Design a protein around this motif. Structure first.
Motif, mmCIF file in Angstrom:
data_model
loop_
_atom_site.group_PDB
_atom_site.id
_atom_site.type_symbol
_atom_site.label_atom_id
_atom_site.label_comp_id
_atom_site.label_asym_id
_atom_site.label_seq_id
_atom_site.Cartn_x
_atom_site.Cartn_y
_atom_site.Cartn_z
ATOM 1 N N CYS A 156 0.691 1.409 -1.542
ATOM 2 C CA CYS A 156 -0.648 0.853 -1.396
ATOM 3 C C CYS A 156 -0.707 -0.067 -0.183
ATOM 4 C CB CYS A 156 -1.016 0.093 -2.674
ATOM 5 S SG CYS A 156 -2.728 -0.461 -2.899
ATOM 6 N N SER A 157 -1.771 0.080 0.603
ATOM 7 C CA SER A 157 -1.927 -0.677 1.837
ATOM 8 C C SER A 157 -1.729 -2.171 1.586
ATOM 9 C CB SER A 157 -3.311 -0.429 2.439
ATOM 10 O OG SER A 157 -3.496 -1.191 3.618
ATOM 11 N N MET A 214 -2.869 -4.602 3.323
ATOM 12 C CA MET A 214 -4.157 -5.252 3.533
ATOM 13 C C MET A 214 -4.961 -5.301 2.241
ATOM 14 S SD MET A 214 -4.142 -6.285 6.610
ATOM 15 C CE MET A 214 -5.863 -6.733 6.820
ATOM 16 N N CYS A 215 -4.931 -4.218 1.469
ATOM 17 C CA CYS A 215 -5.629 -4.178 0.192
ATOM 18 C C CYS A 215 -5.083 -5.246 -0.748
ATOM 19 C CB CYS A 215 -5.481 -2.795 -0.439
ATOM 20 S SG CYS A 215 -6.616 -1.568 0.228
ATOM 21 N N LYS A 216 -5.982 -6.036 -1.325
ATOM 22 C CA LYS A 216 -5.579 -7.105 -2.223
ATOM 23 C C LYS A 216 -5.508 -6.593 -3.660
ATOM 24 C CE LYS A 216 -7.435 -10.871 0.604
ATOM 25 N NZ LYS A 216 -8.421 -11.985 0.679
ATOM 26 N N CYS A 269 -6.102 0.154 -5.011
ATOM 27 C CA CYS A 269 -6.452 1.037 -3.909
ATOM 28 C C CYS A 269 -6.919 2.383 -4.439
ATOM 29 C CB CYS A 269 -5.254 1.231 -2.963
ATOM 30 S SG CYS A 269 -3.661 1.100 -3.809
ATOM 31 N N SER A 291 -5.192 4.325 2.726
ATOM 32 C CA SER A 291 -5.784 3.616 3.848
ATOM 33 C C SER A 291 -6.263 2.229 3.429
ATOM 34 C CB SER A 291 -6.951 4.414 4.430
ATOM 35 O OG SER A 291 -7.453 3.799 5.603
ATOM 36 N N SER A 292 -6.375 1.343 4.421
ATOM 37 C CA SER A 292 -6.814 -0.023 4.164
ATOM 38 C C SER A 292 -8.285 -0.100 3.782
ATOM 39 C CB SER A 292 -6.552 -0.898 5.390
ATOM 40 O OG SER A 292 -7.072 -0.295 6.563
ATOM 41 N N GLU A 293 -9.056 0.957 4.038
ATOM 42 C CA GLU A 293 -10.462 0.972 3.652
ATOM 43 C C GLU A 293 -10.647 1.151 2.152
ATOM 44 O OE1 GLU A 293 -9.555 0.710 6.794
ATOM 45 O OE2 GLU A 293 -9.810 2.842 7.250
ATOM 46 N N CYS A 328 -9.407 -0.246 -0.619
ATOM 47 C CA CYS A 328 -9.264 -1.302 -1.614
ATOM 48 C C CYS A 328 -10.431 -1.301 -2.591
ATOM 49 C CB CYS A 328 -9.161 -2.666 -0.934
ATOM 50 S SG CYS A 328 -8.295 -2.632 0.634
#
Ligand SMILES: *[C@@H]1O[C@H](CO)[C@@H](O[C@@H]2O[C@H](CO)[C@@H](O)[C@H](O)[C@H]2NC(C)=O)[C@H](O)[C@H]1NC(C)=O
Ligand SMILES: *[C@@H]1O[C@H](CO)[C@@H](O[C@@H]2O[C@H](CO)[C@@H](O)[C@H](O)[C@H]2NC(C)=O)[C@H](O)[C@H]1NC(C)=O
Lengths: 502, 502
Positions: B158-159, B161-163, B167, B171-173, B175
């Motif tokens: 899981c990215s 960036m994702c908190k 996810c 990808s970070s989009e 989340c």
């Protein structure tokens, strides 16, 4: 529980001798005044206890020209102001000069529309210490307030126990309850400073508790004590399958409340609105009456005074008398005034002749009121209305009366087919020759418990019994409208046409 | 902007060659799916770009038996769940083994009713990391999640960036946006931790602000970007005068939205509901389409399959063929299956005969669909439905088709009077001898841009020309239902009877 107000609007009582009785009949037991609460020309020491259950007034409150030192309106809470006095005031206190001393509107905490007019009350002491911006609604701050402080009475100081020096009277319990101003949060009504105390959006005039059931009053529509934005619809819409279905919780809309069934003398629409007139393109049918669409173009309707063109017409004159020819039902009212049977030099209206009153021979129902303050002295009875059966009273003269007979030379009543006074009071007074007033079973004609007959200054029963005037020996229960065999209400034996015959 | 949904419900496509075309026609440009969004049996590298605009699904979302590696749903915000797969799941992802790799439901932040069923996806990765209790509405906390985590992939982590490690994808989009469990307050939805950040009581799936306009989705009824408990009623109640009045702001209720004018092929009601069937004691009539109460008892209306006694009947058979005798308008659908003409010995049902089908000679309009999977081999056409003019398509076979013809020996179509397919698609396939499909002006029959003709495995047009089954010369614009001068849709010269003559 609910009642309608009056439209007197500062005019002098038609029958002062029974004015107090009219108000008591209209307001005994009533909690919601669906109209204007008008208390005028009340004498000193008048017993106004019947007003002590009134909580909500839909129109305006008009206290004027009274000598009563106090008005028992303590329980009153909300004045919606849907109708206003002078178009600007929801509470009007005028010319109470003996005279009003304290307003004592302890529970009043909300005025949805309109201002306050307190003028020329030389004994009113505490009207100046009330912070009216708290009573006015969050959306009625434009409400103008004109208060006259010129008071003859020496004014006692506001009670110690009372806080903020805001009082409705000298008593400790007369203290004003400030709901709108106190709210710290952006809520219209709160129990106290804390945000939790804020009342639900629906709640009006304060809330005993946070939940919408606990409102002291309903902003839009009460539902068995549950305030609602709109009454539950008779049919609900299914989003999944595009179909409407009947709603078991559906309720009819009556005034500011939700009712399970349409109240008597009202018309229920398919949308669930309980109304007094049918919507456009609809006709009244009987199933109880309902408004049903006229799929075929609606037939020609005879419109009475107060409706359509005749809305502003004061009375039935020779100009409009032919408008009622052949009409068996009038949507509106009938009023016969002194100028009806005389001529107007300016408007070139010829006097009404008695031969022109026979256009009402076929008349069977009047949706409004029947008002007669003048009648041709040739005719001893209201026999042009003999075939009239029902006066609905959906429109009331002065807001109170559906049948009024003033100053007539008639000797008896000719309304032998009259069986129902749907709503309103009956005022028969000052008919020096009218005898058969108490021989009529008015209780049989009335449909509501507020309805009563107010009578004064007619021919005394002594005179009628003395000169042989009485119901015929063939009447049932001694109920009749006149001296003849053709005037009985119910007849003991088989009838020959109109005539009751052994 | 709106579109219906299919009712395949995990069944195989009738025409696999045209299944993807069916979905594209139904969903291209559509934003709100009034029904179930079913994506089944899609092949690898299938172009699914038409789904990119879908934001709201009224029913359930069913992704199953697909080979695509990704389903292009990324703007889907709310699944209302008014119809549920197996009655327990508003979202179902089953047997996607290519195969589904990531759900990628980035904008999914609300399920009004129902749970999630993710089973047997040997390539799905991040179904476990999602906090489904967040997506489920507070009322729908009963929602049961049955998620299968048997995956044959070594999945990229899981990215970072994702908190919260939530996810929808690598990808970070992707989340997951938390909107119900990150709320400091009692608000159902919140855009942020702060109490001010929560959304309006009507707001659904989140909001961009505190007001009712801001909501990403509407909880009950969207009103041109405004979320309201109900659409503005066509009539409104006056409490002062006790009557209803027309409301210029009044709106018709269509699905989950509120519209100015009732959409085509829908019934308008007096209460303002745009429906597919009239309420009880209401008959359909032209104002367009309207539902009017019948003062007299409404006349006898023929009921087709799927309505009333024939709601659980699959096909027209000898048992119920005579119920359509003399019918001019059928309320419901007509389906002719192989067992219609073969018969059922188990129920002692006699086989249908070509002589029995003549009861449809007077049939002019079908409100549902016309489905024909079997036809007598002695009948080379559909001339039984010669006088049929309109197939409304209010009921659709599998939720998509209003006119389906499969596996028939007919050589031409006899639908001489067919002028309108109100809703749904046309599926004519595997009719080897059917030579007059393309002559028909299908574009003039359709009333929606969603509608199209799906045809395959029919007599090649080259064979048509070679055998001579060309359009009749006297026909206009080469538009003929069948051979001969009687089958022209429009006749260039004057028409003698039903025969176009020179
Ligand atoms: C809504 O209507 C109900 C019924 O009309 C009101 O309940 C009544 O309240 C007064 C209390 O003095 C009396 O008429 C009855 O005791 C009550 N009737 C019941 C409970 O059936 C209710 O108060 C109304 N709501 C508001 C806010 O006024
Ligand atoms: C309520 O309906 C309106 C249309 O009647 C929606 O506005 C459209 O929203 C979509 C996105 O879902 C846009 O692609 C369109 O361009 C919008 N059209 C217009 C005219 O505004 C609106 O989004 C709906 N409200 C909600 C909360 O979904």
């Amino acid at each position: 529980q609910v009642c309608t107000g009056t439209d007197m609007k500062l005019r002098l009582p038609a029958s002062p001798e029974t004015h107090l009785d009219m108000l008591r009949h209209l307001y005994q037991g009533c909690q919601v005044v669906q109209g204007n609460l008008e208390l005028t020309y009340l004498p000193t020491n008048a017993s106004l206890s019947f007003l002590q259950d009134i909580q909500e007034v839909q129109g305006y409150v008009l206290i004027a020209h009274n000598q009563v030192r106090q008005v028992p309106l303590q329980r009153l809470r909300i004045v919606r102001g849907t109708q206003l006095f002078e178009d600007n005031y929801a509470l009007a206190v005028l010319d109470n000069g003996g005279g009003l001393r304290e307003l004592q509107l302890r529970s009043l905490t909300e005025i949805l529309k309109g201002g306050v007019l307190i003028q020329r009350n030389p004994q009113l002491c505490y009207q100046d210490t009330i912070l009216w911006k708290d009573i006015f609604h969050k959306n009625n701050q434009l409400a103008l307030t004109l208060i006259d402080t010129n008071r003859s009475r020496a004014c006692h100081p506001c009670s110690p126990m009372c806080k903020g020096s805001r009082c409705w009277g000298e008593s400790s319990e007369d203290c004003q309850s400030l709901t709108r101003t106190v709210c710290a949060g952006g809520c219209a009504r709160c129990k106290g400073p804390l945000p939790t105390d804020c009342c639900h959006e629906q709640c009006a005039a304060g809330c005993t508790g946070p939940k919408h059931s606990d409102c002291l009053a309903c902003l839009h529509f009460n539902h068995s004590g549950i305030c609602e934005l709109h009454c539950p619809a008779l049919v609900t819409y299914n989003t999944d399958t595009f179909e409407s279905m009947p709603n078991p919780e559906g309720r009819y809309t009556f005034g500011a409340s939700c009712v399970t069934a349409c109240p008597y003398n009202y018309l229920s629409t398919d949308v669930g609105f309980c109304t007094l007139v049918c919507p456009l393109h609809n006709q009244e049918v009987t199933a109880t009456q309902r408004c049903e669409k006229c799929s075929k173009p609606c037939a020609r309707v005879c419109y009475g005074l107060g409706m359509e063109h005749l809305r502003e017409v004061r009375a039935v004159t020779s100009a409009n008398i032919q408008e009622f020819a052949g009409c068996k039902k009038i949507f509106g009212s009938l009023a016969f005034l002194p100028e009806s049977f005389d001529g107007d030099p300016a408007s070139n209206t010829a006097p009404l002749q008695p031969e022109q009153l026979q256009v009402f021979e076929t008349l069977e129902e009047i949706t409004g009121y029947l008002y007669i303050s003048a009648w041709p002295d040739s005719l001893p009875d209201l026999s042009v209305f003999q075939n009239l059966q029902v006066i609905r009273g959906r429109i009331l003269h002065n807001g109170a009366y559906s049948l009024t007979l003033q100053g007539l030379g008639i000797s008896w009543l000719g309304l032998r087919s009259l069986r129902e006074l749907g709503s309103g009071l009956a005022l028969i007074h000052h008919n020096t020759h009218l005898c058969f007033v108490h021989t009529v079973p008015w209780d049989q004609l009335f449909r509501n418990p507020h309805q009563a007959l107010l009578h004064t200054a007619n021919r005394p029963e002594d005179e009628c019994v003395g000169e042989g005037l009485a119901c015929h020996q063939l009447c049932a229960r001694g109920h009749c409208w006149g001296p003849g065999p053709t005037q009985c209400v119910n007849c003991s034996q088989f009838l020959r046409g109109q005539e009751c015959v052994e």
